[PDB]
Write a protein that binds this ligand. Structure first.
Ligand SMILES: NCCN[C@H]1CC[C@H](CC2=N[C@H]3Cc4cccc(C(=O)O)c4O[B@@-]3(O)O2)CC1
Ligand SMILES: [Cl-]
Ligand SMILES: [Cl-]
Ligand SMILES: [Cl-]
Ligand code: NA
Ligand SMILES: [Zn+2]
Ligand SMILES: [Zn+2]
Length: 358
């Protein structure tokens, strides 16, 4: 890598790892469109297995960017429209509170207060129907954004129904395979388990536990190389030869709602570039990111703006991930760690690196 990249990465990430007690970390810096890889520490402490470019990390809610792009691809195929009612895809959802809730609302957390988590008691198809049939909205649809797995998770499950594929098969066939993300998994196969890092929480080695709609909301695992390729693909969608996927990437970066200086895409979140770094850093704290806030609709949605900071945080019990990129500058970063450490620390480090390189 160029010396300027090596320098800023050492001076930013090694102290972050020191400050936050991160056991293992992988970073890709995309500079002039090309990834440069860095690793530190251990994927498995007790085995003394190092983080490598093949180590799988849990992406947590960075998975929602895959779900958003898969939904965009379905839009580009004509399989769904965001204005469609939820009940078009799930007719058994006969409870009246669902009248007026569209796929757009599910995808963008604006259905009116669907909860952050699907309850752990939901273990069967009938349990899930019962949960949504009995959910009572706090607000009218299209007025308040409340970040929620039960919202975008249901969006992803319904968006694949016209294809006839399971969510996993749709994601594999329509996103992972065309982009050559050959080490990205919803379910890690037995022969790849040797590369699956442990997450660390309060000194204990942990992996994400199964839950309803986990694949759609938080269940993807990937390597630093595949995640760099994901960033490259979202930086430069015209490089993608599959037109529906090129367009799905673009649609996931369209601006559907605004709250303050933040815009909601499909999975991705965006701000105008140049960005006020304090807004992305502070806005990433869960006290804010998880709070309900009023949204203003953007109709028609703004087509993807290349002068944007586009990003997403992710967490599981044992992992913390962050992706950010700036299409206009051909500049991005992926930070994968096997500890869930505070979001503002992630965003600050990402800002420091990308700001030094623009
Ligand atoms: N399709 C809904 C028909 N109206 C019904 C109107 C009463 C409402 C009770 C309620 N629950 C909260 C969430 C909510 C949802 C939709 C509309 C509103 C509204 O105030 O208009 C709304 O406001 B709330 O404070 O009022 C139940 C629905
Ligand atoms: Cl130094
Ligand atoms: Cl998979
Ligand atoms: Cl977890
Ligand atoms: Na699952
Ligand atoms: Zn140093
Ligand atoms: Zn050190």
């Amino acid at each position: 890598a160029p010396q300027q990249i090596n320098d800023i990465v050492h001076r930013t990430i090694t102290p972050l790892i020191e400050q936050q007690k991160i056991p293992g970390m992988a970073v890709a810096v995309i500079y002039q469109g090309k990834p440069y890889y860095f690793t530190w520490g251990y994927a498995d402490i007790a085995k003394k297995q190092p983080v490598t470019q093949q180590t799988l990390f849990e992406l947590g809610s960075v998975s929602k960017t895959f779900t958003g792009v898969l939904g965009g691809d379905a839009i580009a195929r004509g399989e769904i429209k965001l204005s469609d009612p939820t009940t078009k895809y799930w007719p058994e959802l006969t409870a009246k509170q669902w009248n007026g809730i569209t796929l757009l609302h599910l995808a963008t957390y604006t259905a009116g207060g669907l909860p952050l988590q699907v309850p752990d008691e939901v273990k069967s198809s009938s349990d899930l129907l019962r949960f949504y049939q009995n959910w009572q909205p706090a607000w009218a649809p299209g007025t308040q954004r409340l970040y929620a797995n039960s919202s975008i998770g249901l969006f992803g499950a319904l968006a694949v129904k016209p294809s006839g594929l399971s969510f996993e098969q749709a994601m594999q066939t329509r996103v992972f395979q065309p982009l050559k993300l050959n080490h990205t998994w919803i379910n890690v196969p037995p022969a790849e388990e040797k590369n699956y890092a442990w997450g660390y929480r309060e000194g204990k080695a942990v992996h994400v536990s199964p839950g309803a709609l986990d694949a759609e909301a938080y269940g993807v695992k990937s390597t630093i190389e595949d995640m760099a390729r994901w960033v490259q693909s979202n930086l430069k969608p015209l490089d993608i030869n599959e037109k529906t996927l090129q367009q799905g990437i673009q649609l996931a970066q369209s601006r559907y709602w605004q709250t303050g200086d933040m815009y909601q895409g499909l999975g991705w979140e965006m701000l105008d570039w140049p960005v006020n770094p304090d807004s992305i850093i502070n806005g990433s704290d869960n006290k804010i990111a998880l709070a309900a806030r009023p949204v203003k609709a953007i109709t028609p949605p703004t087509p993807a703006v290349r002068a944007s900071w586009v990003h997403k945080t992710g967490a599981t019990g044992g992992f913390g991930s962050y992706v950010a990129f700036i299409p206009e500058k051909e500049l991005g970063i992926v930070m994968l760690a096997n500890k869930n450490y505070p979001n503002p620390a992630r965003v600050d480090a990402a800002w420091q690196i990308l700001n030094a390189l623009q």
